Amino acid sequence: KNWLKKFASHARLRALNGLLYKALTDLLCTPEVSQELYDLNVELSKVSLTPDFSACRAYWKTTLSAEQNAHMEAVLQRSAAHMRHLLMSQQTLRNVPPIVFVQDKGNAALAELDQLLAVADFGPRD
Amino acid sequence: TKFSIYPPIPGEESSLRWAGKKFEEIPIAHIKASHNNTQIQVVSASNEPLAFASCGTEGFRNAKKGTGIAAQTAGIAAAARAKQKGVIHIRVVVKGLGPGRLSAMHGLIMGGLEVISITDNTPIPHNGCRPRKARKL
Amino acid sequence: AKHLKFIARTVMVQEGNVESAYRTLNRILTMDGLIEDIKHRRYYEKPCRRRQRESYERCRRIYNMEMARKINFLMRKNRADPWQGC
Amino acid sequence: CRLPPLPTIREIIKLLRLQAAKQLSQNFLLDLRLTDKIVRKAGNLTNAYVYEVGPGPGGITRSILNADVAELLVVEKDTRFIPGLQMLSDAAPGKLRIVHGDVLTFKVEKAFSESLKRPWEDDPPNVHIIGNLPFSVSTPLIIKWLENISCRDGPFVYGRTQMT
Amino acid sequence: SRYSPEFKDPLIDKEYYRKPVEELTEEEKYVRELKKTQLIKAAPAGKTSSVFEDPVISKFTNMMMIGGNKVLARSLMIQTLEAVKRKQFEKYHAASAEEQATIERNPYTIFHQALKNCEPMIGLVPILKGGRFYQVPVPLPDRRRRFLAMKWMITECRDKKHQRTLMPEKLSHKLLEAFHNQGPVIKRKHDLHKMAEANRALAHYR
RNA sequence: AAACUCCAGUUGACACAAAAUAGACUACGAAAGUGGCUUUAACAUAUCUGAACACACAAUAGCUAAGACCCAAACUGGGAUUAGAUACCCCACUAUGCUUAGCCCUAAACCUCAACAGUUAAAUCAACAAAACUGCUCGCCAGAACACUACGAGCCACAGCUUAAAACUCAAA
Numbered sequence: 001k002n003w004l005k006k007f008a009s010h011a012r013l014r015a016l017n018g019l020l021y022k023a024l025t026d027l028l029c030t031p032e033v034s035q036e037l038y039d040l041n042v043e044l045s046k047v048s049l050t051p052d053f054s055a056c057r058a059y060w061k062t063t064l065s066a067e068q069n070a071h072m073e074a075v076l077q078r079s080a081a082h083m084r085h086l087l088m089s090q091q092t093l094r095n096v097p098p099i100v101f102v103q104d105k106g107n108a109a110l111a112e113l114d115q116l117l118a119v120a121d122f123g124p125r126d
Numbered sequence: 127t128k129f130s131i132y133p134p135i136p137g138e139e140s141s142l143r144w145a146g147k148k149f150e151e152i153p154i155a156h157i158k159a160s161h162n163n164t165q166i167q168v169v170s171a172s173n174e175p176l177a178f179a180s181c182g183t184e185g186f187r188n189a190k191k192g193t194g195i196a197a198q199t200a201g202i203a204a205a206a207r208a209k210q211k212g213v214i215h216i217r218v219v220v221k222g223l224g225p226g227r228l229s230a231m232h233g234l235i236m237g238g239l240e241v242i243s244i245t246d247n248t249p250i251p252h253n254g255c256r257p258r259k260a261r262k263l
Numbered sequence: 264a265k266h267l268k269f270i271a272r273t274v275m276v277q278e279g280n281v282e283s284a285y286r287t288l289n290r291i292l293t294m295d296g297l298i299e300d301i302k303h304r305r306y307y308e309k310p311c312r313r314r315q316r317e318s319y320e321r322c323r324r325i326y327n328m329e330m331a332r333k334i335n336f337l338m339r340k341n342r343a344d345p346w347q348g349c
Numbered sequence: 350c351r352l353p354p355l356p357t358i359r360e361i362i363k364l365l366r367l368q369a370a371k372q373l374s375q376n377f378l379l380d381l382r383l384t385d386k387i388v389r390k391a392g393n394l395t396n397a398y399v400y401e402v403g404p405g406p407g408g409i410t411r412s413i414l415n416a417d418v419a420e421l422l423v424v425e426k427d428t429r430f431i432p433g434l435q436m437l438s439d440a441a442p443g444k445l446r447i448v449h450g451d452v453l454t455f456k457v458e459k460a461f462s463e464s465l466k467r468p469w470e471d472d473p474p475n476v477h478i479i480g481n482l483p484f485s486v487s488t489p490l491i492i493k494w495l496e497n498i499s500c501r502d503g504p505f506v507y508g509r510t511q512m513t
Numbered sequence: 514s515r516y517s518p519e520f521k522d523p524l525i526d527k528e529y530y531r532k533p534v535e536e537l538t539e540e541e542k543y544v545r546e547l548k549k550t551q552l553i554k555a556a557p558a559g560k561t562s563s564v565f566e567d568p569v570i571s572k573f574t575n576m577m578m579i580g581g582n583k584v585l586a587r588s589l590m591i592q593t594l595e596a597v598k599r600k601q602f603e604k605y606h607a608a609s610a611e612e613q614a615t616i617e618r619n620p621y622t623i624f625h626q627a628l629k630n631c632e633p634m635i636g637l638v639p640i641l642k643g644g645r646f647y648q649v650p651v652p653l654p655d656r657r658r659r660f661l662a663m664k665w666m667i668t669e670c671r672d673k674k675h676q677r678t679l680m681p682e683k684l685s686h687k688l689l690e691a692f693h694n695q696g697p698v699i700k701r702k703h704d705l706h707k708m709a710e711a712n713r714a715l716a717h718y719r
Numbered sequence: 720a721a722a723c724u725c726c727a728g729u730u731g732a733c734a735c736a737a738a739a740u741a742g743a744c745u746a747c748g749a750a751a752g753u754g755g756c757u758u759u760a761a762c763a764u765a766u767c768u769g770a771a772c773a774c775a776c777a778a779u780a781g782c783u784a785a786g787a788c789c790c791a792a793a794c795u796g797g798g799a800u801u802a803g804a805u806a807c808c809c810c811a812c813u814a815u816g817c818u819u820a821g822c823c824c825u826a827a828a829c830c831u832c833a834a835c836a837g838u839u840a841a842a843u844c845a846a847c848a849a850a851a852c853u854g855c856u857c858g859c860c861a862g863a864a865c866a867c868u869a870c871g872a873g874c875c876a877c878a879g880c881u882u883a884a885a886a887c888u889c890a891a892a
């Protein structure tokens with residue numbers, strides 16, 4: 001079909017989010033996407049679909065090192081299209097919107113607050 | 127001597143021994159990692175069931191069966207029940223691509239058994255039965 | 264079933280490094296195409312869809328290889344300017 | 350008879366608290382002219398007792414009420430349209446009786462008076478059912494009402510009640 | 514502001530200029546040459562190259578100020594320091610030989626330790642999102658907690674239940690109480706550190 | 720949640736079902752189609768064109784008898800779901816998908832390119848599609864809708880398939 005020309009040129013939403021979360025975790029469990037990505041052991045927190053099904057935001061847990069975070073970010077944006085193709089080819093969803101990898105840092109507040117409460121002084125009846 | 131990734135063969139003699147036994151005499155831990163459940167059965171080389179543990183047998187219920195923690199607990203239970211029968215070294219035979227594929231092996235190792243080889247036996251038909259239709263979610 | 268066991272898809276653990284053995288087995292199954300076959304065999308792919316997918320994958324590979332060849336060929340020119348000013 | 354205006358689509362969206370035209374999940378006949386055509390095809394309703402189902406905004410309700418019915422019984426499953434139907438009732442005193450509940454489960458054999466019960470062998474017993482319901486619930490209702498006709502009970506305790 | 518942006522803050526440190534050129538690092542050397550070209554603002558009344566300068570006590574005096582009356586504020590501060598010193602001497606003279614090694618008589622050490630003992634490490638932020646105020650914990654910055662300690666001390670000493678007890682006498686007593694981890698200021702810190710734990714689950718929201 | 724608990728795991732025996740990888744190959748056949756292994760037959764024409772109807776074939780679906788039945792699955796039941804729920808998710812199981820002998824004769828049956836022979840010089844050429852043409856032959860088309868329609872005729876079809884108009888109407892399509 002002239003491929004050279006082509007290349008040259010809500011309750012339902014919650015179920016879809018859960019299904020896509022499981023599918024993306026399953027995809028990341030193996031080197032199916034790439035060996036480099038498999039090495040980094042990316043872990044996902046949640047998957048959120050926009051109300052118009054225009055984009056899929058996958059929230060991946062960040063680490064403490066910054067260079068590792070940057071490398072993970074780069075490989076994830078380079079591999080998102082391959083994940084979309086794999087998801088659509090496996091017939092997990094007949095049409096998947098573009099996948100966007102967003103960093104998750106919500107646990108940082110809890111971690112810092114735990115660290116400070118460990119060393120804080122509550123006095124009598126702690 | 128260079129380490130061989132390939133398993134030993136029963137015919138050709140080899141110097142690899144584990145606690146004095148040969149490769150084909152080590153017990154086998156069969157892991158079935160389904161999508162909602164994981165089942166571990168330890169058997170002897172002569173196919174004597176020694177221990178059995180699945181995520182449903184360790185109290186996990188419904189969707190909690192198909193998680194890594196549940197498979198780890200099942201692996202630990204099977205490892206304990208097999209350690210009580212004289213098993214130390216095991217050959218792991220995994221079947222399926224469920225969430226508990228690797229958590230069961232974590233549990234088995236954390237229960238004290240030593241894994242000497244990993245084998246995959248996931249059923250791959252050469253186009254036999256027809257699969258079901260894709261879900262229209 | 265009728266074959267000898269512990270020969271196919273079997274990996275030996277070195278120095279108790281179970282993680283490396285498992286990851287090597289995953290690499291083997293992925294590069295032999297077994298993982299993709301398992302994932303694709305969960306639901307039935309209609310013959311026309313399979314044909315279209317295979318054609319798209321083949322032509323995508325061809326186009327990507329051609330574009331990469333073009334970029335590598337034209338990368339030789341990318342260097343410091345020898346006639347700067349003019 | 351002075352009736353309140355027919356709700357527009359925007360008022361319906363706001364009443365359902367949807368804030369969009371894409372999560373409606375329903376189709377409304379908001380043309381009083383087609384509804385008048387339907388009630389015309391329902392026969393001559395002068396001094397008749399109508400049991401309407403699935404009014405929603407109430408175009409069919411208005412069309413029937415303009416015809417000189419003796420009393421109109423409405424069964425609505427949404428509380429969100431009951432205010433509009435109450436305004437319609439205030440507009441027409443005594444000709445509209447609104448009931449909240451399912452049409453699959455409502456018991457009509459007690460709704461109207463016992464003086465309308467005409468023998469089966471005679472003409473249709475001056476009672477009529479008119480309905481513009483969702484297509485996902487109109488088929489169980491017709492099956493149920495066919496069973497009732499076979500047993501001559503339910504809405505057909507009055508006789509050979511006509512349905513539209 | 515009557516100072517142009519090119520003007521920079523002065524550095525009143527006296528030993529900083531005395532650092533030998535041998536010790537200077539290349540970045541330090543670079544900044545030392547760079548400062549030559551810059552314009553420097555006139556040093557404000559207050560901080561001096563003196564050896565008895567205490568920025569913390571100066572800030573406390575500034576916070577005790579009412580109506581620009583710095584003379585009275587500094588008078589109160591020096592009276593507080595003298596009262597603390599006299600109370601410690603009076604307690605040290607009446608102490609046994611083995612207790613004399615564990616009585617502090619320097620008022621500056623007592624003041625700094627009293628303010629440190631009252632610094633809260635965690636605080637609360639009012640945040641109305643769901644139509645209702647939700648007080649969530651937050652890690653306080655160091656400057657924030659240092660300010661909060663001073664403000665709690667001053668507000669505690671401005672309470673009206675203390676009638677005719679002059680501010681120097683109230684403030685010396687409160688400083689000596691906080692030196693031993695006692696008094697209402699330490700209880701105010703404790704009631705905040707407990708109310709920030711009783712609303713720990715609210716960190717999930719934020 | 721229903722369902723099963725004559726259930727599930729290892730091991731052994733075991734299809735009238737469909738044929739991983741090779742295949743990133745682009746082959747065979749008039750088309751439709753054809754991708755597990757072996758063997759037997761076997762892939763017309765020493766000019767070209769030549770049919771809605773003549774003579775032989777035509778994916779999938781569908782219909783007669785007999786048979787097989789793992790899995791899948793129109794329908795049919797049950798489970799869960801808002802406030803007119805999920806038609807869409809889950810479980811069970813039919814016609815059917817398979818074999819033998821007959822029918823039915825339709826597809827976006829498309830490379831949306833009629834068959835053979837020739838040319839690349841021209842002005843290349845409405846646009847897009849797929850560079851522009853020539854010679855010769857058959858088939859077909861002459862505004863839209865009425866109309867993949869009515870009637871007539873034919874057919875293993877009985878509503879089906881092929882062929883296929885007219886009246887009124889419009890200035891457009």
Ligand SMILES: [K+]
Nearest residue numbers: 827829830831
């Ligand atoms: K085509």
Ligand SMILES: [Mg+2]
Nearest residue numbers: 767768769834
């Ligand atoms: Mg010919």
Ligand SMILES: [Mg+2]
Nearest residue numbers: 770771772858
């Ligand atoms: Mg002809």
Ligand SMILES: [Mg+2]
Nearest residue numbers: 777778824825
């Ligand atoms: Mg056919």
Ligand SMILES: [Mg+2]
Nearest residue numbers: 780781815816
């Ligand atoms: Mg058939």
Ligand SMILES: [Mg+2]
Nearest residue numbers: 788813814815
């Ligand atoms: Mg069947």
Ligand SMILES: [Mg+2]
Nearest residue numbers: 780792815816
């Ligand atoms: Mg079929």
Ligand SMILES: [Mg+2]
Nearest residue numbers: 833834857858
């Ligand atoms: Mg021809």
Ligand SMILES: [Mg+2]
Nearest residue numbers: 867868879880
């Ligand atoms: Mg016809």
